[PDB]
Amino acid sequence: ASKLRAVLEKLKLSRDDISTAAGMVKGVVDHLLLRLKCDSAFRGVGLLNTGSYYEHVKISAPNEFDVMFKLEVPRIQLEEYSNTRAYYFVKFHLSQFLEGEILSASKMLSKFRKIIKEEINDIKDTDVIMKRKRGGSPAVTLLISEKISVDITLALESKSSWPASTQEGLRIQNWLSAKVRKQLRLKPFYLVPKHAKEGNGFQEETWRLSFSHIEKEILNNHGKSKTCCENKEEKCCRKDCLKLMKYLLEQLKERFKDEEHLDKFSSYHVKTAFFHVCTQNPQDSQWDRKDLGLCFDNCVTYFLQCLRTEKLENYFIPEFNLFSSNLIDKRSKEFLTKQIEYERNNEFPVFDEF
Template sequence: MDPRRGKERRTSKKAGAGTPKGSAQSARGGSEKPEAFSPASGAAISSSGRCSPAGKSVPKKSARDPQKMPPGPGAKTAPLRAGDSPPLGAPSADERERQKAPSVPPEGSEPSASAEPPLPVVRCRRPRGTGSRRGGGADPALERRSAPRPEEVGSPGRESASGWKPRQVLKNLKLSLGDISPAAEVVNRVVDHLLRRFQSSDSEFKGISVLHAGSYYERVKVSVPNEFDVMFTLKVERIQLDEYGNSGAYYFVKFKRNPKGNPLSPFLEEEILSASKMLIKFRQIIKEEIKNIGDTDIVVERKKRGSPAVTLLIRKPKEISVDIILALESKSSWPVSTQEGLAINNWLGAKVRTKLRRQPYYLIPKHAKDGRSFQEETWRLSFSHIEKYILESHGQSKTCCENGGMKCCRKDCLKLMKYLLEQLKKKFEDRKELDKFCSYHVKTAFLHLCTRDPDDSQWLPRDLALCFDNFVTYFLQCLSTQQLKHYFIPGFNLFSSDQIERVNKEFLFRQIEYERNNGFPVFWNEF
């Protein structure tokens, strides 16, 4: 039996071959070149850079109808070669004539799930004090974005260029000490109890330790402290990683040598460390132990398909969700797929990059998607600890946002964007289009944007509204081009068609565009 086939019989639908390199298209992520869909009306496609660490310039584009994106007046198009299909959404000659007639949409109308009327566009400048990505020279071409009403247009440096007040939103989102302390106390007590259980037993997980991760510990949590992420890490030595397909992110794990007495031997299947077996055992121990935690009402939520987390729901005194994730810790060199990732040389510096790449990396039992099924024996790379470090030390200046140091609005922009996605998911919770989008997509886009705009002067607090608008523009571009490269694994595309369907990206694009055109009404739903 080919060990790369893993536990094929465990998959919800048999995945076929064990995907040697070059196969398993669904695991490739970024190996395909996705086709950009036509963005919705009035969308801003920034000229500042694509969704990649390189930050190279791309031609400016103004968006039109979500289903059809005709060339503008005077636009030149290349003739089609024999056998070529016209571009997606390309109009006929008659349609182009009809589209020349002006159309004025009803003000403030909400987008449908399929189309939206065209809106005007306005040119807006980047925040004052910013130059090229290296900090010198003038700002490049002016950028285009969806226009607010004429009376709402402000000048750079004002609270908002479109009438809404981001500072007030952030004030509403600020977590109070009275909310944080009780929630953190309950979570810490539960985590400490589980940790003692794992460390005191003679089980396979005796050497486990805790690594706090996620938005709460990165200090970018928004709204209420009701979700926590905790990694239970287990050191493994002398392991060999066999890449699953050409994903760059998913691997089979083997031991180079398997001496007698290896506590993980019970989880081996034909030399492969079974992710599914370890996760089942890990989950079983947690389910048994939470019964022994007094004064707390806790249940283990039903396992989500393909999820690596064991989710605890603490129901008293307040409802809190805690994702506990098993992770293997390896101190060997990072895999080859990460060599071009973590592009922070022009932002945090080459020395910091070298230092970070000497840190361990982690592997979590995340199943690779294989068509409509999952390969249950794969492990996925995780760099949560590096992401946490970057967010804590986010400035080009070492004293950025410290007492007495220069302030920036990077984390404020991240909080606003996370809250925007969170509120949209809540607004459409009875639909499925936004189910696969998560805060990690927002954080990844944010890290790319910081790479593109590395100077602290490009993130001045007085320019919060414009910096956030740049972030929204950038995220819309990622959706439009269907390209969001993993920050550490550039070959893995988080927005590829097999990760998230195109229709879902179009839906989110239209909703974000509507929010921006109308002053983000979704921000005020709860206040």
């Protein structure tokens, strides 16, 4: 009926596209998993599916999938890197990766990337290529059949207690319950080969904490009520609001692709801000389908406040500020503030098709 509901209709994924893309991705991922198990270093890899497709908040087309290839490293000892809260040294067939007693993130990622590159070349039945290494990413990115991108992130799995920098994160007690928080923090955590900033460069030995699996569990079990979105009387608009925030940023980045001020914004910024708004608004009655426009406004104004105050804490690691001036210039946040305010004040013309 409404403008926003019409936008959501256009953002829905086609069942046929899903069927084709799911089969294509599974074939390639399962192949690489099998072949990586042949290498002595990656003998123990397992699959975890992550990101927006597996949280059912992928929009427009199923053409971008995220997966972790995780390895359990028992007796893992961590050392936080230079008070960064999110980046760590890992102290420790893995010997090829040691730089001292440090298990080098870049060394492992390099070898991981090299094995995958050699293995996709032998896939003659399918058209699979490696995309160029994108700086700062822990992923190795594939393109299947010129159309579907798959980001494969190497991860070390730890079944130890989560690091102390997470003690005050995951503030879900009033929304999803204290007992759920306790259950989630008994799950493993992951380290991925995303390196801390060091000057104008990177500390290439360091790893980054990742809780992508907890983000998926929260998105796929997202209500105060256990039956949220399982029946026609409890269809909340939380996922719709995240889809609309993602589309707002996707559209602005496309329009402003030649404007440097939008380069460092990402869908993870809107995902993080969305989790915070869920913490702020914990009741399912604050996400009623009939209030879609108000709920989406709640999300837009929260994100605008994050930009203006330069505060967007990582949801798991509260002293890691994604909107720190060390990461994004004030001028760039003000620029995005300007464009989002324009959309809010004009009923989101960037959502119009014509």
